[PDB]
Amino acid sequence: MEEPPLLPGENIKDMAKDVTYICPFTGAVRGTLTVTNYRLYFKSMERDPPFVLDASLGVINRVEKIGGASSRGENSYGLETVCKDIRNLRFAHKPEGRTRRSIFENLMKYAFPVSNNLPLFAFEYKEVFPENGWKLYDPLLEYRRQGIPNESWRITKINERYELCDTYPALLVVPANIPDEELKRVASFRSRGRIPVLSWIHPESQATITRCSQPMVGVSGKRSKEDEKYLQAIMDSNAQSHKIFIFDARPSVNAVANKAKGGGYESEDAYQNAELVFLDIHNIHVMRESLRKLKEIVYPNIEETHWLSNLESTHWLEHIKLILAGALRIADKVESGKTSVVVHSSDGWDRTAQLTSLAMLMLDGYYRTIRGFEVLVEKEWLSFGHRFQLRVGHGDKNHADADRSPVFLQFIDCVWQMTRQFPTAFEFNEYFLITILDHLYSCLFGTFLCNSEQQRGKENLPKRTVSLWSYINSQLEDFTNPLYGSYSNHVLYPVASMRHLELWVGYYIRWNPR
Ligand SMILES: CCCC(=O)O[C@H](CO[C@@H](O)CCC)COP(=O)(O)O[C@@H]1[C@H](O)[C@H](OP(=O)(O)O)[C@@H](O)[C@H](OP(=O)(O)O)[C@H]1O
């Protein structure tokens, strides 16, 4: 029997007999196509181990009608689902079978519930696990683990009602001597009120990683005494009071383009004890275009003759390299330079989240534990306002949205690169990372829904959805790396080179039955 298995809360919405799945690798196979509220299940008993294709609906970007009435070929009348996970799926229907319309309509409806005024499956997934992923991350405790608040850094509550910055977490760590009303001001100079706050502190040197958005300098060199005092306050916090380093993730010309617009960067006149460096990491649009090119040379057949040159033309591994190289520069400046660094971009959610979290992964072994990693994600990504729902387009039929970009995917890709370079340094395994990427799109859990901490609170995700961590941690074994424990040498320093970075076959090329 060709019925899909059903998760608690999941159910069949449509079924189709005698549909043909056209496997680019194994030719065609006739079986039964089923659509649930969660998934797209195809299964044929026309083979042996029965043929099964199980794909969560969340990965579907587009559903196209293939062929028409004037389609007289064989397997020319059908559907094609364009996926988010580096594949496209296509099925053939018989016109007289009268199933294509029903399937097409149910796919459109259940793969894009938000566009059809329906819930995302996460709200109807009523499975129950022993551990509760929602209680895993505790801002206050994480800060405490870092030896936060101390004399130099305090915790303010000025953003508890999300009034200071609605895309920031409720609790913020700032210089022990900067008053709430002053912060209220730096917030006026920083884009979207995303002021420089603490992300990490060296246990020893008390060199810091702070994060923020760009300074609203504009065409005319606008300055903020308070912002300048703020960055100064950050420097006065290092017991070996060098200076400051400001890493602008952006290429130079982008930073300037932004300045025309109203944004900009910290000049050497305005911020003196500050050294600014541009990391040349392009925007969300460039990264979307890069992944698009990659999917083409990867998905169905790879053209072996020109793989290397084709891969180069995508500029994928290059973006990955600049992101890791950037994280490296930050880590080194903190660790070896004993210097505090301020990280930003334009808005400070995207590239900034990539940099802080990777540098933090290089510097703090805690973040390399399975559970530590989950916290890093909850912290740097979720709590700090990476716009997941927007960047992925959860249950939204508008596949051409310019807001869609694989920012988090790049991050995970960079994390994977480090596991390759340091196979004993991480407690989690590849499966763990790939699983994370699958549920990033699945919308089975509420972990990657909404766009800010505030929103997830108002939506009451902890109570209405299951945390991905609940599933993962009540399972640890599937996601544990056996070689772990030995990275006594505590600062990871991967090599960001085109010769040391590989294309993540495990993820981008996993559909081939080899
Ligand atoms: C004051 C200027 C502010 C700004 O961000 O402007 C730029 C655009 O300008 C043109 O398109 C028009 C020029 C007339 C974009 O400048 P730019 O740096 O090229 O690009 C940003 C950057 O990628 C942000 O992430 P982050 O900085 O955290 O890594 C995204 O969130 C933002 O998109 P979204 O949030 O709106 O979806 C995107 O526009």
Curated annotation (Swiss-Prot):
**Which disease relates to this protein according to its record?**
Charcot-Marie-Tooth disease, demyelinating, type 4B1: A recessive demyelinating form of Charcot-Marie-Tooth disease, a disorder of the peripheral nervous system, characterized by progressive weakness and atrophy, initially of the peroneal muscles and later of the distal muscles of the arms. Charcot-Marie-Tooth disease is classified in two main groups on the basis of electrophysiologic properties and histopathology: primary peripheral demyelinating neuropathies (designated CMT1 when they are dominantly inherited) and primary peripheral axonal neuropathies (CMT2).
Q: What is this protein called?
A: Phosphatidylinositol-3,5-bisphosphate 3-phosphatase MTMR2
Record-listed a 1,2-diacyl-sn-glycero-3-phospho-(1D-myo-inositol-3-phosphate) binding positions: N258, N283, I284, S346, D347, G348, W349, D350, R351, R391
What is any one of the record's Gene Ontology cellular component terms?
A: postsynaptic density
As for family, the record states: Belongs to the protein-tyrosine phosphatase family. Non-receptor class myotubularin subfamily.
Record note on what altering D350A does: Loss of phosphatidylinositol-3,5-bisphosphate 3-phosphatase activity. Loss of phosphatidylinositol-3-phosphate phosphatase activity
Q: What do we know about how this protein assembles, alone or with others?
A: Homodimer (via coiled-coil domain). Heterotetramer consisting of one MTMR2 dimer and one SBF2/MTMR13 dimer; specifically in peripheral nerves stabilizes SBF2/MTMR13 at the membranes and increases MTMR2 catalytic activity towards phosphatidylinositol 3,5-bisphosphate and to a lesser extent towards phosphatidylinositol 3-phosphate. Heterodimer with SBF1/MTMR5; acts as an adapter for the phosphatase MTMR2 to regulate MTMR2 catalytic activity and subcellular location. Heterodimer with MTMR12.
